[PDB]
Nucleic acid binder design. Structure first.
Lengths: 206, 59, 158, 263
RNA sequence: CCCGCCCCUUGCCUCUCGGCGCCGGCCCGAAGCGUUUACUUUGAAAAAAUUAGAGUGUUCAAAGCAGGCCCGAGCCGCCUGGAUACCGCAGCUAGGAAUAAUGGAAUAGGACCGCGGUUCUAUUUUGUUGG
RNA sequence: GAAACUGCGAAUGGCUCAUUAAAUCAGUUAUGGUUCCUUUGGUCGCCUACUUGGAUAACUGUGGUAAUUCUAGAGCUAAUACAUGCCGACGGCGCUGACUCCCUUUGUGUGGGAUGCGUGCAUUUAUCAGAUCAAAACCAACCCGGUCGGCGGCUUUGGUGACUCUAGAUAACCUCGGGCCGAUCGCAGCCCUCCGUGGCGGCGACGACCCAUUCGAACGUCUGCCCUAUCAACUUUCGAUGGUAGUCGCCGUGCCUACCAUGGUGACCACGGGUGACGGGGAAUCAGGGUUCGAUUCCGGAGAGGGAGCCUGAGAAACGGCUACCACAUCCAAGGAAGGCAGCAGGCGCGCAAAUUACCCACUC
């Protein structure tokens, strides 16, 4: 119906070619996923040669990663901020490859606190002392220090990172096609990208 | 309804599975012998090359 | 180089990561970027200029994804007035067997040009090679540029 | 016509090395899918009534194959058509006969009878090396056998002897200059001669010179060469003719010399 | 009209890795190529039928791809064909160097381990790992 | 052993030449840009298991409609249909380290260690590895040839001309109703610290996941075209050419969308128009060079009254499948229903112009 033909469209000279063969099943469209954020709705689509293709509508979880220290945990996908293909897609909260979105930022802290033995940015130390100090202080004899010594000075954590934990959000990059895969996935922004997209955000809105 | 014939097909079903595992054992055994054999010839060749180099250096 | 972004998106090479390990350079140092390149094979050689320089382009074969496989051809420059591509020409001779004469015919083709080459001028010989499609009228990329023909680009004392 | 795959091949579309006539009807057998390619096959039924003449109609072959007197590559087959090709062994055990499929210097599959002892193995070219899962290698051959754990010096364009009984190759030949080769396709076909020289081009369609023991030099593409044994010493049995590739004048001279068309 | 010689002769080197030699030392095949093309010559690769054309007594022929042999059956068989040529172009391969285009140092750079001045970089070795 | 469910085929063939001028098609090349039923070869263990769950047909019986290969209601009963889900043999791996022992409090050098979680392949993402070049002089931690501060001796998959290849490691992701790892069927044998059980062996049949193969399919490269200028400028936000990102698709790609640039093509004939133009292998004539024809038995393509959409399947935008509009034409109790001979015969019409409503699966497939 809606098709992805190539026997339409002008040649280089501005010429036209007269109608040749009728539309066929291997040149075919099928309308866009237009996936949002919400409760999971998945549809299974039969596709050529078999080998079913998953189309995801309204995901709310993706597997992001923090490849700086190589941990990857499942985290909720809150809202869109920047979509580098169009401005309109952000307004209706459409989710596609290479967007910039927000997450809860929760397990990354839990991992950091247990492994590097330090909290991130904090409102107050009063919260920590009755519980959440129980993990941070430890009763080991022998391997209070012995393990943790090797973790020291490999946890400088950068300025633009640390400030974001306090808000409870982090900026990560969709590196999947949700409409073809059936899953959202990605990597979290680091380095110069994370400097770049801040400037685009503050430029465009506000 | 279970009959003796049924149980044969299930007994032969598992006999083949065990036979399969025993075969992947023996192949990897022979290949390891063969693989470890070559670790010898190659070494010898390397030694020879080294000797040649030394001779060349001589002058 | 220090600016290579003018898009609404960030530009970078695949197969590159930015580590956050160690901290001590003093003033400056590693630009926090190792360069990516690869061999092309077939007796063609990567330019020094590619490995030196900084550009992000995915359609050149010295950096980005695209192979050269199948045919290899030549041509000549005729025009450049487009960004990251050129136009070229192929002069050749068509024979007729009723007569015993030939006649001239030419076709024109576009082909993509790397930001690596920037010494191109209109009238240089160019070499190209078959590739997977990049665009509607681009199927090729440059492998090499040369000048070795009459009325050279600069005075003889080289 | 086409919307999916075809299931007919006519008489006149079919290759000429099956030596078909033109006064039986429009269709020809067409080999069904298998390890060999249809411009290199000899379909089974063409061996049984257009060569050896046991059968006379296709319905007879259907009554024969069902009885399970036929084998191919030491296993039992039971269909009108099977795509056996170069270097396979047919085995009828009732007659005590064994055949081999190999090329005349004319370039067509002949009758090359052999001892049953010879018919316990065949010679197979290697074409591709492919590392499988968990550090295990594979071979790929033209008869489409995947033989795991080969020796680690065997590479493509070599040939390997396979025991039909147990698989799992016992020995091999290594591709080297001066070894004896047979041709399997192209304009030169069925010629036997030593390698002599190689030629390489980065790219594709490398060629391979050849010379025989009649003092003639010729060349062919790389991928039409098959190795048969070391220099002037085949590791297989050879038919009459022996890759000489006589001119037409000399062939005339032989026939009028023996005066041979009667016994 | 295939080796060499006058200066040249398939122009050179540089060498280094895997063979041939001769008595550590020395010699010569393969590796980059001779500024680029047309042209010409050799290979490769080319569906069948048709066509040309070899063989074969279709009763001769148009055709066809067959068929021919010795024995009362007592051989339980023997022998043999189903060639070869052609296939505009364009593309692939190798040889030739006349002919027709194209090529270089004249506001100099070609040659030699000729030296200086200046800068960047390669990761090998002092058994290993770090400064 | 009728019938009926299930599996498979019906996308092959046959027919026509209407469309179609760089399109079709031919030679040549490319998948390192992809999909592939089937065959062939490999892949086959991290109060239920002596076998799980509940309905449909045929069948039995009662009906409706003018009419259809129309169809309702009631009573039964199956599975390689349908929906479920164990067991066996896990004595698997890394990182935590309750702890405990020796020598330097610690740190750090040590040996064992309970207790936790993950630990087949497939799927998606991030990260790491994917080694060897050419030599020395001292200092810091150190093996061996060996000694109570210092000398000599080593270093580790596969493949291509060329890949972000193949295989490996780490951290995770999991699709259920929507990955795999058999609750299936037929022939004929055995063995029991032993008496029909607990065990196991051969020969098949079917099904399923992945890899390879075969038959292809689909896009892409270079070159090749009849008449016409009383057709010379054409193409563009109704994307024309390119750049960047995304969507979609089996994949590559302005294929499509957003943003941005202003290009692309032509006297070497573009663009436009015409063709009683399907293309090629070929055919007729012919000294040499040519001219003319090719609907038509082989190969490729396109189409089934004209248009469009779609289901099923590995493969179809199918017409011996379906739905709608338009042009036709048929039946009707006027409520409705049914149709597409460019398949073989046959009829009407059209014309200068063209055969039997025959016999038969024996051959060839």
């Amino acid at each position: 119906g809606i098709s992805r033909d190539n026997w339409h469209k002008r040649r280089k000279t501005g010429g036209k070619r007269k109608p040749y063969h009728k539309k066929r099943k291997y040149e075919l469209g099928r309308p866009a996923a237009n996936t949002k954020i919400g409760p999971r709705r998945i549809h299974t689509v039969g596709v050529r040669g078999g080998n079913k293709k998953y189309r995801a509508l309204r995901l709310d979880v993706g597997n992001f990663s923090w490849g700086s220290e190589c941990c990857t945990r499942k985290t909720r996908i809150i809202d869109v901020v920047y979509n580098a293909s169009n401005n309109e897609l952000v307004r209706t909260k459409t989710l596609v490859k290479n967007c910039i979105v927000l997450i809860d930022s929760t397990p990354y802290r839990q991992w950091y606190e247990s492994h590097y033995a330090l909290p991130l940015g904090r409102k107050k130390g009063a919260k920590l002392t009755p519980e959440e100090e129980e993990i941070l202080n430890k009763k080991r004899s022998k391997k209070i220090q012995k393990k943790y010594d090797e973790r020291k000075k490999n946890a400088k954590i950068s300025s633009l990172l640390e400030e974001q934990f306090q808000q409870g959000k982090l900026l990560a990059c969709i590196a999947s096609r949700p409409g073809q895969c059936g899953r959202a996935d990605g990597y979290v922004l680091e380095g110069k990208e994370l400097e770049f997209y801040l400037r685009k955000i503050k430029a465009r809105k506000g | 309804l279970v009959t003796p014939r049924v149980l044969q097909h299930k007994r032969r079903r598992i006999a083949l599975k065990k036979q399969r595992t025993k075969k992947n054992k023996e192949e990897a055994a022979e290949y390891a012998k063969l693989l470890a054999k070559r670790m010898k010839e190659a070494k010898e060749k390397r030694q020879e090359q080294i000797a040649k180099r030394r001779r060349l250096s001589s002058l | 180089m220090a600016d290579i972004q003018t898009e609404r998106a960030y530009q970078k090479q695949p197969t590159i990561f930015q580590n956050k390990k160690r901290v001590l350079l003093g003033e400056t140092g590693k630009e926090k970027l190792p360069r990516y390149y690869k061999n092309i094979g077939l007796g063609f050689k990567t330019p020094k200029e590619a490995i030196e320089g900084t550009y992000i382009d995915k359609k050149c074969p010295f950096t980005g994804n695209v192979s050269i496989r199948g045919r290899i051809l030549s041509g000549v420059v005729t025009k450049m007035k487009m960004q990251r591509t050129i136009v070229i020409r192929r002069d050749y001779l068509h024979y007729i067997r009723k007569y015993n004469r030939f006649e001239k015919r030419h076709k024109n083709m576009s082909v993509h040009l790397s930001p690596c080459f920037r010494d191109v001028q209109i009238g240089d010989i160019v070499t190209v090679g078959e590739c997977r499609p990049l665009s509607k009228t681009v199927r090729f990329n440059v492998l090499k540029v040369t000048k070795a023909a009459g009325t050279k680009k600069q005075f003889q004392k080289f | 016509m086409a919307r999916g795959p075809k299931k007919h091949l006519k008489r006149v579309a079919a290759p000429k090395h099956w030596m078909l006539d033109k006064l039986t009807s429009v269709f020809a057998p067409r080999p069904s899918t298998g390890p060999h390619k249809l411009r290199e096959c000899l379909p089974l039924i063409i061996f049984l009534r257009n060569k050896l003449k046991y059968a006379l109609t296709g319905d007879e072959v259907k009554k024969i194959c069902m009885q399970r007197f036929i084998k191919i590559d030491g296993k039992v087959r039971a269909d009108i058509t099977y795509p056996a090709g170069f270097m396979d062994v047919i085995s009828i055990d009732k007659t005590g006969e064994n055949f081999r499929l190999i090329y005349d210097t004319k370039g067509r599959f002949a009758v090359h009878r052999i001892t049953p002892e010879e018919a316990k193995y065949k010679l197979c070219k290697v074409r591709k090396i492919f590392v499988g899962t968990k550090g295990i290698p594979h071979l790929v051959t033209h008869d489409a056998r995947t033989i795991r754990y080969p020796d680690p010096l065997i590479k493509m364009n070599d040939t390997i002897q396979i025991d039909l009984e147990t698989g799992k190759i016992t020995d091999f030949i290594k591709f080297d200059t001066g070894n004896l080769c047979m041709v399997t396709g192209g304009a030169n076909l069925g010629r036997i001669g030593v390698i002599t020289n190689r030629e390489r081009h980065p790219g594709s369609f490398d060629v391979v010179h050849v010379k025989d023991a009649n003092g003639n030099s010729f060349a062919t593409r790389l991928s039409n060469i098959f190795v048969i044994g070391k220099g002037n010493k085949p590791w297989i049995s050879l038919p009459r003719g022996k890759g000489i590739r006589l001119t037409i004048a000399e062939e005339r001279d032989k026939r009028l010399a023996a005066k041979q068309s009667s016994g």
